[PDB]
Design a binder for this molecule. Structure first.
Ligand SMILES: O=C(c1cc(Cc2n[nH]c(=O)c3ccccc23)ccc1F)N1CCN(C(=O)C2CC2)CC1
Length: 243
């Protein structure tokens, strides 16, 4: 395998041996992801922006520490995103998931739960859910004290005109001219620190009080209902440091 070590370690992490796992070399599993993966240089400004994003948008439970930052390009996704690439309000947002899902997530992308599934466990319907604060997303890694390494995505999400809710709707259907849902949290990143890569907003202000009174959520949530509104950009490998 010519692939860089961090990339090889990641491949190992999300496929894992044992059973029908004594088999399949690194490069074959990599090609299986239908994804280009490059290591973001630790010294890059890209890396600095991302570490600031992690550091600032994070209390109690565990301590997050970045180990590796990967730039990812899933086959065909950028071309799929073109419909929404010139739609106002695009943000770089977090998506955590458990490691065992990342093989599927990288090869198939993030997907909309099938229409037949029941509506419980979908606070804002069957969509793709993001956060503007890593701590929120990082709980969905379900990482343990025993294996305290986790994977979180950063995706460019084309939110457009948001539909702003303080409570669960449980439906996947938006009013006319709304393209996404913003779950309104108590805490929000400080807008005076938000910067703009590309024309994509990176909300890396330190968490402050949002002023929103009557609400269930500690943190904002963002939900889109069309896979073409998501363009995955980075994958972070994170050390969780517990108590
Ligand atoms: O985004 C979600 C999702 C995530 C969650 C949990 C969650 N997980 N991760 C987060 O970063 C996050 C942030 C804010 C709010 C919720 C989350 C709940 C309901 C959901 F439908 N997906 C459902 C599971 N996904 C799939 O691709 C499966 C195949 C259908 C990815 C898309």
């Amino acid at each position: 395998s010519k692939l860089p070590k961090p990339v090889q370690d990641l491949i190992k992490m999300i496929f894992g041996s044992g059973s029908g796992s004594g088999g399949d070399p690194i490069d074959v599993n990599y090609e299986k992801l239908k994804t280009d993966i490059k290591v973001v240089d630790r010294d890059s400004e890209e890396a600095e922006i991302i570490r600031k994003y992690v550091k600032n948008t994070h209390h109690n439970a565990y301590d997050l520490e970045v180990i590796d930052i990967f730039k990812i390009e899933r086959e065909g996704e950028c071309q799929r995103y073109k419909p929404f690439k010139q739609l106002h309000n695009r943000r770089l947002l977090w998506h955590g998931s458990r490691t065992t899902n990342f093989a599927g997530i990288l090869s198939q992308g993030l997907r909309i739960a099938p229409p037949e599934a029941p509506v419980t466990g979908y606070m804002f319907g069957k969509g793709i859910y993001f956060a503007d604060m890593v701590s929120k997303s990082a709980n969905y890694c379900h990482t343990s004290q025993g294996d305290p390494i986790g994977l979180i995505l950063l995706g460019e999400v084309a939110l457009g005109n948001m539909y702003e809710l303080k409570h669960a709707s449980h439906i996947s259907k938006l009013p006319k001219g709304k393209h996404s849902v913003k779950g309104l949290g108590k805490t929000t990143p400080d807008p005076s620190a938000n910067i703009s890569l590309d024309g994509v907003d990176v909300p890396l202000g330190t968490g402050i009080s949002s002023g929103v009174n009557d609400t269930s959520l500690l943190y904002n949530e963002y939900i889109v209902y069309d896979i073409a509104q998501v363009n995955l950009k980075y994958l972070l490998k994170l050390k969780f440091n517990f108590k």
